[PDB]
Amino acid sequence: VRLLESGGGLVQPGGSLKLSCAASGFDYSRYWMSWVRQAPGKGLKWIGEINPVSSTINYTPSLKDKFIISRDNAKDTLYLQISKVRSEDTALYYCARLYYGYGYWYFDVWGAGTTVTVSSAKTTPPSVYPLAPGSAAAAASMVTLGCLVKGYFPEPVTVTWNSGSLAAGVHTFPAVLQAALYTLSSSVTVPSSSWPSETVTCNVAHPASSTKVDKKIVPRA
Amino acid sequence: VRLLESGGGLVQPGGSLKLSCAASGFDYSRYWMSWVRQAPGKGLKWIGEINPVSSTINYTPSLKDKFIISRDNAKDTLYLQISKVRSEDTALYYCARLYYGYGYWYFDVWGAGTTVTVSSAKTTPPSVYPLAPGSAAAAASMVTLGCLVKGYFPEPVTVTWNSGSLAAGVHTFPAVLQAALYTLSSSVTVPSSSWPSETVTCNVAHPASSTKVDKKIVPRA
Amino acid sequence: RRRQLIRQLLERDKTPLAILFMAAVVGTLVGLAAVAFDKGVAWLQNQRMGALVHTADNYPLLLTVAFLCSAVLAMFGYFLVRKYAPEAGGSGIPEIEGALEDQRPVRWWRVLPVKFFGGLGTLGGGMVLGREGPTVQIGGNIGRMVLDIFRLKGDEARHTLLATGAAAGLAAAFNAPLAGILFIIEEMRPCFRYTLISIKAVFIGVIMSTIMYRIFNHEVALIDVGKLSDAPLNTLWLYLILGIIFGIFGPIFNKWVLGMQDLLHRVHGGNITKWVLMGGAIGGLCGLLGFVAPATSGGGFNLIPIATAGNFSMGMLVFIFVARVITTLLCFSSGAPGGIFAPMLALGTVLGTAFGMVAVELFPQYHLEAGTFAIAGMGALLAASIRAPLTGIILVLEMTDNYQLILPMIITGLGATLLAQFTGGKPLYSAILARTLAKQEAEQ
Amino acid sequence: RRQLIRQLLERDKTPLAILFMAAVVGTLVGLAAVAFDKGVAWLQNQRMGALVHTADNYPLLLTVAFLCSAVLAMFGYFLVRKYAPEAGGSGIPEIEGALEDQRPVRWWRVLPVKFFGGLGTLGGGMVLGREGPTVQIGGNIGRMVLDIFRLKGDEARHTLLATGAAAGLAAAFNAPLAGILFIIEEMRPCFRYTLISIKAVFIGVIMSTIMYRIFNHEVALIDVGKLSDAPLNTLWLYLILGIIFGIFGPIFNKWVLGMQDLLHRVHGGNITKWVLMGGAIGGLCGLLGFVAPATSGGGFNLIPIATAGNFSMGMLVFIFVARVITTLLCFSSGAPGGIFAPMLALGTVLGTAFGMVAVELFPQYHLEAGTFAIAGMGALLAASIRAPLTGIILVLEMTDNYQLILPMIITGLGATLLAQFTGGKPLYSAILARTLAKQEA
Amino acid sequence: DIVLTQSPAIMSAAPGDKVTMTCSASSSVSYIHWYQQKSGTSPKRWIYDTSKLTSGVPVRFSGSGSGTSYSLTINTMEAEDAATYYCQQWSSHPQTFGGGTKLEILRADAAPTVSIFPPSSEQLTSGGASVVCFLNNFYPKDINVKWKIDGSERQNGVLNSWTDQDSKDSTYSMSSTLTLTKDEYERHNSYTCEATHKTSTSPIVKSFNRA
Amino acid sequence: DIVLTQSPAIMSAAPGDKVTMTCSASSSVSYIHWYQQKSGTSPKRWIYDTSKLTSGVPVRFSGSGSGTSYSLTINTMEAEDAATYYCQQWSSHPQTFGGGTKLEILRADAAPTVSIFPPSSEQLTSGGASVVCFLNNFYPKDINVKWKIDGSERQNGVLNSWTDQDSKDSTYSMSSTLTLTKDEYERHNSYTCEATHKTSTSPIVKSFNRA
Ligand SMILES: [Cl-]
Ligand SMILES: [Cl-]
Ligand SMILES: [Cl-]
Ligand SMILES: [Cl-]
């Protein structure tokens, strides 16, 4: 019983896109399907719904051809078209299977979500800089390393340490946007005896701009 | 309602191949499905059957795992695996949907069939050569054009004219075998006013090598 | 009282083998009879369409051969009734009801050919009448014929074999085994006096005739509607409201049918000339309407699947209803051979769908489908005019196969029967018998 | 004739007072049935919790299985013999009597006795149904509201007693139509006509079914899916199945009665030997509901499993014989709880068995044993209680395989015919007749 | 397993004739089905349960029989009926098919339309050279095709292919193909194609010259 | 439409504690639903029709209320219990959700593990210089950072970013990053980073000198 939406990403203002939600694990007919978006920071908001026979399509109070919901029962997939896209449409979109108990309807099962970004800003690779502690600092119990990932667009990037093996004592901070570019940092606190005697590398992937990069954190001489 | 079976072509003696039959237009998880074969120029022979819940599977008097029939209700596909193949298995395999009137079951809807050739030769794509009249053409009301198809293996090939918009006036001749390669040609008769003033293209397809050749018939210089 | 009861309890469910074997042959015959009848009506409706193709050019000439063919066949039926068997007018279910109380004769030597060949005329002409009327009465007479021919003795054999035929008659009319049996033990069963109708024997008759129906009419359902959506608990009150609407209308439809029997009797005064002629005028109107607006005329089974899917507009549903009310009255109230049972399904469907449409837009939170209200309304008029809800419910259920709607179907139906009672309406099959019996003593 | 015209025009007229009271009966019967259903589950749950706390020591776990079931059985058996003897066995025969004005309805006694008594026998894992309890309880609820509201007349006495018995069966199966049909087929004094208002019975059943769905929605008692159809050239096989049920029907009726006798000798009417033997049987159920859960318990669990053809041939014969044995020991020993449900499970198993044989004997028919399971399910109900029309609609309402209506009818009819021609008798009528004959003996 | 045998393996009839073919069984069969298989097409369920017609099957068709003999009958056969008809049973197991009855159509005469074709330049710039000659839409099927290079008769390297009887006009068509090497073809000049048929006493000639 | 407001916007409670959140409606509503979202994954259905658990939901959770005021409750909270709780109605159309209630774990206070980092040689080659300061693992989430260049306060070019509550110790982390041009960076020497927390009265100083 999995719902899988796709087709998010970056669109220019006044454009249009077509999100897809591919269903599996149940009879896709008999069920009503729905779209619900979550604006960054804000709460959940209902877009619309569609019955199995596609004879009733309902939307939130939303002007004319802004939203077009449909479904193809043969491919077992749900669609959503947004036209004349503005920044308010920058959100995370969920498809949901509709059901009920006493008859006051709920949102039964949800998809994982696809993120839609509406920005005239251009796709940009990230620059990845190590963060080694200087000769000014003395090592206690632990030693904090890191790498700065700056000047990219859009979200997301994925940071792992030693190809995911060093999964303990890792913080990755939310990215912050400035002047049409994102910046984020990631820490990795490790035992004092473990570095620099053993190699610590951070792995950064920005798929939007085909970037895969490894940055080795070496001490300062 | 349509049954479109596939996965035929060339196999070595003693080998094995998996035939599929994709179904659409009917509740596939409701019917018994069946396979029947027809050797070139011969009669029909029932191979097997399978109920919707895959619990009952009857075969014709065969050996061990000579035939193996299965079905995937999620994909709407019927499968047939043939083992240790000898030349008696060189046939056209129909995928048929089963049903009854009073209760004596019949083969309700048949597919188009896939051909299986059990030979030692090699998959060779066809060579398509256009056939147009020798310069001095005593043009009557009609002009007969054709194209030659040679050096392919195995069978079959399909030949249509102008993507099938030219239906009337076409004869396609049964392939002839020589030195483990097949040869056929197709004729077409069009109004003399309708050529060379218009385009006449023969569309040859040899699915065994996944090859299309669209040769266009040019008047001789 | 107690000693006698111990004797009764131990003797219960014991039907003489002779009655059982005879119940089988009754059903067998009633089945074949119903099948043959069904083929005839189709064959004649087919010929009428063949003639319309032969004159598909001249528009007024096409409208002429529509009227004439339907008139000629209607007149043929109306005549066959007034000339040979008067009791075979209208439905004929009230006539079988009387026969069970030993208050009406079963003149099978007359009615069988009259209702059969007479029905073929009215139904095959395109008139708004059902098959049940014909098949129930025909079925009853078949049960009497085999009683007579085989000279069977007893009150049990006379009532039982007359009943199983009436049931196998309804069964073979709808492919509805259970609806047939229930209809007898809810409507017919002398409703004030205990009888000797053996239930087990009724069953066998129904089975044989249903099998006979399936031998010739396999692989096709009378009504296909598909599997509809379910109904949530928080929507049930909407079905009760639908019942109330059927509950006030039920008796009002009953007044009209009776009143119209009267108003149409003045036109001819009992005259076999004015009657047959008027009968043809009505019959001709149906073959005309069964062309310029086929939904207004005909049996009604055709527009049920279309209505359930929500393919008609609101305006078109109101139109169909009013026109079909009119045409249902003109056909049945004018004593034509043919039941009113089926036309009442079509009316309930249409009315139900109409309510559904209103309900859908008034309550988007419910996620409604007008189709469920069509199926709830289908057997609702049967519950408010014939007052046989349990029969109506199981009939619809057997024909539409939407068991998940059993609660809305019951609630709507019960709602109809309640308000039909509290607004002074009376079971239409009982009132038509009571009028016949009161007028029989009104000239003595 | 003049009297008939008076009758016809007065038909289907039930006093508004009776109608409004019918509603309240069903409402109560529904809630009662629901509360009863929750209790049984609650107690079956406790029993499984104790088995977890002693899941280590094998003989120790087999002990706490026996004991728990014995202790709860004894509690039920005692509550019956001490306060309301009439609440033994099913209780449907007792309500049938009450409709002929031949038995008293002591609701002040039976309601607490059948309820809390049933909770003991059912909740202990014994092979008994809910119908017995719910129908009897339902009838008494209809008597209670007759008494409390002081309603006068033969109509009100019989009608309100009936609607409660129907709403009782309805709420036991989620089967509205089966409830109504059962009254107007089995109960309805079978020899004289009555004032049982059909319209009033309906209302009661509606309210109790609504009550059942308010607490038990989104889950069906039996799920079987949509099975295959049945070709016309296969119907004769269903007739043969009826014949086999037709011979066995009355023979199962002999054993149930004979076993009531054989078990009465063991205790002689003694409230000590009765309650103790009641616990020995009850304890055997909780023991078997672990070492072979199919042989014990209500039976609804193994129906879906049987229909799918998940049991082997050997396993089907085993279950049948063991389930015959355990059905008799529980019902025939006067324990509070119906035999209606256990008979469904028997018919399913027998049907499936016939289906398996049929499948391999006729590959040309493309059979599925599952269709013979659903045909057989209500077949024993047709051959032993001789209410086929109720049995058919009951199965239909619970399985939703309308495409099998012909095989279901044919099999059922076949059963009722051969049950008559081999001298069998409607078991609910025979049990009333034995109680009434021993009352004057 | 029951063996079905269909009486005429191949039969000829002119449209208008009443036509009957037979399916006979080794054991005892009940309710058999018939399938039509037109040229280069899949079998289509035609008649079922002995005498019922599938939807779309014209009323000119009828089935009957019982026990060991069954028949398919075309009352006033029509040209479009040219197909091979298979019978089938599944009253026993496993189900089994008949041998087939190929129905051929007798019709009026039709002279072939002969067309000659030179080896294309794309085929020449490869190695071989095939000269092709279509003779189309003739009746009856018996035809003789003769090859002449510079008057001289050629015997070896000729391949012929005939179509099945056409489903609409009931005519036959043939194609003849003379295959040679590039050098073999280039050392001559005139190629002819001689077609002899019932419709003409003197053979039909079509020819081309490189010069 | 109908507006739903949830009382505690953010709240904290130690493991094994009675937690109660509201959901108040503008107009009258009936039978509301509750969803639990953990950051990074799908919202999942928790409580429906005023107060019914879902197949899997542990028995410690409960709903209640009617008319215009409803509430979700946790008797004995757990670790795997912290997440966001959205109420949702559909008694009226169109349906609406609550603003959200973030439920967070309460713990014993923790002092920040401050770290300061010089710009890399790679970043300087580009002509930019970022000074990163990691304030790691502190409770509560409230903190103040302060930058000092040559012992002088700086407020321009600073970017702060908190992680959401951790799932191994339920502490927060933060990062302050100061971005200057290479020239602007090279004209100073002393870069200090001051973390001011609830734990101490005097800020934790971490600095480095270019010399
Ligand atoms: Cl009438
Ligand atoms: Cl009628
Ligand atoms: Cl009992
Ligand atoms: Cl019982």
XYZ file of C-alpha atoms and ligand atoms in Angstrom, chain C residues 87-95 115 137 261 332 336 338-339 429 432-433 436, ligand 1:
21
model
C -60.817 -11.019 -16.238
C -57.506 -10.797 -18.139
C -57.582 -6.989 -18.191
C -54.982 -4.842 -16.424
C -52.438 -6.703 -14.298
C -54.176 -9.921 -13.303
C -52.354 -10.219 -9.996
C -55.481 -8.985 -8.164
C -57.415 -11.707 -10.040
C -53.404 -13.049 -21.838
C -51.700 -14.639 -14.145
C -59.775 3.613 -14.548
C -52.677 0.378 -17.127
C -54.862 -3.236 -21.174
C -49.979 -6.051 -18.828
C -48.658 -5.365 -15.332
C -53.353 -4.947 -5.626
C -58.249 -3.314 -7.275
C -59.593 -6.686 -6.067
C -63.933 -5.670 -8.471
Cl -55.345 -5.856 -12.748
